[PDB]
Design a protein around this nucleic acid. Sequence first.
RNA 1: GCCUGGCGGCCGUAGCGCGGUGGUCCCACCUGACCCCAUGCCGAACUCAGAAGUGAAACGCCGUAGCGCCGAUGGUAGUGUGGGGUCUCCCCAUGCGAGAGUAGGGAACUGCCAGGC
RNA 2: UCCUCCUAAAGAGUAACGGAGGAGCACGAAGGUUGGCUAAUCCUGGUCGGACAUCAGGAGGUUAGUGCAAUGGCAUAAGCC
Lengths: 136, 94, 178, 79, 116
Amino acid sequence: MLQPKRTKFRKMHKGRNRGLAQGTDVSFGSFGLKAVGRGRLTARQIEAARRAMTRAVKRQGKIWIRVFPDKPITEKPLAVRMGKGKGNVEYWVALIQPGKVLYEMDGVPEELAREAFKLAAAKLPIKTTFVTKTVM
Amino acid sequence: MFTINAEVRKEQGKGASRRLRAANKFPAIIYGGKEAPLAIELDHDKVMNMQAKAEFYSEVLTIVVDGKEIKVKAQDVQRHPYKPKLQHIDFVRA
Amino acid sequence: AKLHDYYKDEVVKKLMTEFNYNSVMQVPRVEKITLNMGVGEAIADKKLLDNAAADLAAISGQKPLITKARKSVAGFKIRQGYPIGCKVTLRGERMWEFFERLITIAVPRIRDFRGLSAKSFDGRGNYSMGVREQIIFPEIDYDKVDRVRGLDITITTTAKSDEEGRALLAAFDFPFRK
Amino acid sequence: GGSTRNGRDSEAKRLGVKRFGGESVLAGSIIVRQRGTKFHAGANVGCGRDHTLFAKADGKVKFEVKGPKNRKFISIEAE
Amino acid sequence: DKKSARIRRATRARRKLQELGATRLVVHRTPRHIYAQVIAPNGSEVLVAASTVEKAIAEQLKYTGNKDAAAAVGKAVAERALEKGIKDVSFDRSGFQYHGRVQALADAAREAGLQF
RNA sequence: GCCUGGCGGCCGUAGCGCGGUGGUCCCACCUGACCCCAUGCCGAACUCAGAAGUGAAACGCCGUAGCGCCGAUGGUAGUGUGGGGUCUCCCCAUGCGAGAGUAGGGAACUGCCAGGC
RNA sequence: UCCUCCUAAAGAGUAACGGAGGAGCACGAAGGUUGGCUAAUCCUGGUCGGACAUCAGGAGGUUAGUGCAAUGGCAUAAGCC
């Protein structure tokens, strides 16, 4: 899940990010979810939170991702012994900032915000907030 | 037809802007109309409660500043990156 | 040059004259026709090819070129130096002198254009004649001829639309479709 | 994957800066690759080989930013 | 238009002549007219000029594009430069071939006193 | 003043879309081709000799503020030096300050020579 | 041991089995210089040609070419003659 395909590179810097980005705006749907916290988000976290939200809408529509990691992180045991270069890929990671949209939807439920997005959202490393398309 | 009172700003730029953003007021401007660009300070939450109706952004409104009554129309806005709150707004003379 | 006289009088004189049109510098034109003849695969004889190529060059302003292949290696049992044609491209005075025997007497050997359904799509009225062999053009020493080489011949105009070439080329009795 | 060999020779970087001249030789900066970013104009020549801003006559450099589209010039004029 | 080889040839001269500095002869022709103009050593002023539109040489002609009139422009630009004391002028042919009317202009100018 | 050509300068205010417009003048098509000249073949190219045909293509100018392009004021991103903290961020002092957009600007300007009115 | 780029900081230097590739020659021609020229790619269309050997035209591009690393140059061609 959440992997880029046939990449030119795989070794990349971890480094640091300013954590501010840009003001919330939706693109693919009429409704979305904002992060409200800052830091990093893993592919296993994005899928675990998606797996809870798709049941919060039961079987309605499709929920579109607005975070896709495209950055791989490697892990290697201290049994080779060590110092013999980076190992295989273990997780894929994305950047999060308080205004960042995580997911978007338009085919939304009729009990929206009594279930899904405002409520029944789970497995997330931070608390989130529900957001609209806006006309002004 | 809204009517609001404003003051002409005493100081400008990042440091004065962050000094003006102290939860009581926020910055705005009035420009065009063959007259000078006027830098003003507006109430942070009373104007927020007034712009809750689309006529603020769609119909002519009145600003009183320096005891002088200006007729204006809405042009552009800036808001907080994860909150609905006003950071800076543009008006043009009607 | 009795055909060039007519080409400057009756041909395309009425083009757009049923419309709001007066321009004199927009009429379609021809000056050159693309030509090639089958040289075969023989290179060590020379004496039989040279004679028949000179009989074609005798009605053209050109002499036969040596030529080379474009594709030769891994597909055709040849290499880069292989001679593949001769051109002898026809232009100017000898084209309106060829058109003076074309359709007037150079008709009894070519196959009539039945079943034709050909079009043009580039704005220049490109059309190939598909005559496949040289037509024994009857100038002065052509009675001795009973064996002919393969031929490729194609015309193009100085024009803006293929619809202008459709007016011009109809003076040479080419049906476009039959 | 180790070592890596990386290289260690030259820096091929600017030397001739601001308003400059040359008493017996004017050379400016001696830089690789540059032939299409900034061009010589007047008594100065290059574009070999050479990598240099050599001058065939006496004069001083002022640098120009004006020119056709992407072109800018290392102009030399006598006093 | 139709001249993308002539501008390719001319651009070589513009470039190489700006590396040379000094003067240019700036020769041009059409099927109706012949022109030449000596650019001064600054590369940006005209010092002397001659053409088959100037009625001092172009009125006594039966055609303003003829080779004997290209030679008359060669004569005129040479004597005008000889009155201004100029030599070693660089022959700028503006992307043309060095033959015909451009070469007759050169042959006539060489004899009339221009160097070149 | 206006029209054009060359060298160009400046090089998008010089662009795009769409329309208008010139043959006195210049400019291109055009009208021909011995000779000097040219063709792995050719007056095709290069080149010469010119005025019957034309203002189309080509060349040059221009209306049009719709978009590009340039972009104030205000705010934003970032940031030099300093004090703290709730600490790779925030708050304060004091300076700098884009990128994008707005209003405004903008459908250039010009040196030398030459022809034309 | 030799060569180049990035990490490397709006000069350079600048560490990490940090990120990745090359060389220990070859061309008398692929050197010199003067003259002429310049791609790719697709579509259309036609014999001797088995499925495909032709090149002309349009659509269009400095998205072809160069002794090789990567960097950068190159049509004013160093590319093709």
